Curated annotation (Swiss-Prot):
Species classification: Eukaryota, Metazoa, Chordata, Craniata, Vertebrata
Effect of residue 107 to A: Slightly decreases binding affinity for RNH1
Result after altering residue 99 to I: In ALS9; uncertain significance
Residues of the full protein shown: 26 to 147 of 147
Resulting phenotype, residue 11 to L: In ALS9; reduced ribonucleolytic activity; low angiogenic activity; reduced mitogenic activity; wild type far-UV CD spectra
Taxonomic source organism: Homo sapiens (Human)
Subunit structure: Homodimer. Interacts with RNH1; inhibiting ANG ribonuclease activity. Interacts with PCNA.
Gene this chain is encoded by: ANG
Protein's name according to its UniProt entry: Angiogenin
Length: 122
């Protein structure tokens, strides 16, 4: 099924955010059910969805490491880094906006995993 794809979209896709500041992270991390427990780091990709799906085709992706895919095009993104100890609510986050290509895992032609290591920074 496409449950992992729709799940990928739930944790990593946000078409048109308004502000990509700390408050945006705290608000969207709650709405996307990533606050129980608080996910430590999570990145959202912005833009048109067709571009992200495209990462699994040749027109916007290259093989990467072992069974991963890295996009040819760059995407606006916002990485939300947990700040504070507790893995439980309230979850406090620091946002960092960025613009670069992304690394995903594809399945049945659809993105089903986002490799956070490329945005990973304490």
């Amino acid at each position: 099924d496409n449950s992992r794809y729709t799940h990928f979209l739930t944790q990593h896709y946000d078409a048109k955010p308004q502000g990509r500041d700390d408050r945006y992270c705290e608000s969207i991390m709650r709405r996307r059910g990533l606050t129980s427990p608080c996910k430590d780091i999570n990145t959202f990709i912005h833009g048109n969805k067709r571009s992200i799906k495209a990462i699994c085709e040749n027109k916007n992706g290259n093989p990467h490491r072992e069974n991963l895919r890295i996009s040819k095009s760059s995407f606006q993104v916002t990485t939300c880094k947990l700040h504070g100890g507790s893995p439980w609510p309230p979850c406090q986050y620091r946002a960092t906006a960025g613009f670069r290509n992304v690394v995903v895992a594809c399945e049945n032609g659809l993105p089903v995993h986002l490799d956070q290591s490329i945005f990973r920074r304490p």
